[PDB]
Amino acid sequence: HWGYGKHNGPEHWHKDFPIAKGERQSPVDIDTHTAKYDPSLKPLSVSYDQATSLRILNNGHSFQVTFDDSQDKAVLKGGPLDGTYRLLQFHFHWGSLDGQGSEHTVDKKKYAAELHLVHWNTKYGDVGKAVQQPDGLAVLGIFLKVGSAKPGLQKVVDVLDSIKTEGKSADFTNFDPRGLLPESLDYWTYPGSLTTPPLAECVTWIVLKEPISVSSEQVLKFRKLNFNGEGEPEELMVDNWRPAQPLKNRQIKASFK
Numbered sequence: 209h210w211g212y213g214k215h216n217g218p219e220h221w222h223k224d225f226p227i228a229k230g231e232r233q234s235p236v237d238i239d240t241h242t243a244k245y246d247p248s249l250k251p252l253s254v255s256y257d258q259a260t261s262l263r264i265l266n267n268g269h270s271f272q273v274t275f276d277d278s279q280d281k282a283v284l285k286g287g288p289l290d291g292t293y294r295l296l297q298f299h300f301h302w303g304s305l306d307g308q309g310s311e312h313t314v315d316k317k318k319y320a321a322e323l324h325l326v327h328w329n330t331k332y333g334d335v336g337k338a339v340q341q342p343d344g345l346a347v348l349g350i351f352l353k354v355g356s357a358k359p360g361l362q363k364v365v366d367v368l369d370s371i372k373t374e375g376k377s378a379d380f381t382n383f384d385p386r387g388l389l390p391e392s393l394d395y396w397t398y399p400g401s402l403t404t405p406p407l408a409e410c411v412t413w414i415v416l417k418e419p420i421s422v423s424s425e426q427v428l429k430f431r432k433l434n435f436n437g438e439g440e441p442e443e444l445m446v447d448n449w450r451p452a453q454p455l456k457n458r459q460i461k462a463s464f465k
């Protein structure tokens with residue numbers, strides 16, 4: 209029922225999901241002058257060499273690439289995190305125009321898109337249990353700006369025409385998510401939530417400072433996807449981002465000076 213339209217979009221979500229007005233909702237604006245360097249933070253450990261991708265699919269809100277998380281194969285550790293978080297899936301949020309599309313903002317600047325690499329805390333055994341815990345998930349967020357092409361994204365872009373409509377999926381094995389990362393792992397971190405229903409307050413957010421560049425042709429392909437299912441009226445999948453939410457009693461910490 210929920211979506212991104214005028215009658216079912218983010219301003220309506222609180223009716224079915226009252227946590228939408230909660231104390232640790234995401235995304236947020238990152239005020240770079242107020243975020244404080246925290247020397248007690250550790251370097252991120254992004255260990256994706258053994259990642260096993262499985263499928264790519266259009267879920268009617270985004271497209272996602274899924275991974276085998278039945279073993280410690282692609283894991284996120286370190287930084288603000290305690291323990292080991294397994295990569296489950298990645299997906300994107302993007303705009304109808306290059307000046308909007310990201311969920312997090314940086315000094316109110318919106319990027320053209322935002323990549324979320326979603327990981328869950330193995331101490332909770334499965335992702336369904338993890339989402340019920342304040343430290344159950346860690347999402348690595350990466351901004352996209354439009355400029356040069358990202359070679360590691362092209363294999364994704366080239367298969368999108370096969371998952372145009374909600375409910376479509378395809379095999380997507382042997383994809384290396386390391387090709388989506390920027391050079392630097394400098395980051396901001398804060399406690400937050402899922403950015404779609406159920407908006408559960410279970411996420412340690414880790415937002416990289418360095419955006420990746422993608423080409424206009426790459427992002428244009430995102431914008432040709434459909435929110436609707438096959439044989440329904442075409443509504444382009446664009447502007448599938450939640451706007452920044454109140455920071456409330458939270459501090460955003462920087463890993464870098």
Ligand SMILES: O=C1Nc2ccc(F)cc2S(=O)(=O)N1
Nearest residue numbers: 324326345347401402403404
């Ligand atoms: O739109 C989003 N929906 C999600 C849904 C489930 C998650 F586990 C993580 C996210 S997310 O907060 O990374 N982004």
Ligand SMILES: [Zn+2]
Nearest residue numbers: 299301324403
């Ligand atoms: Zn997301």
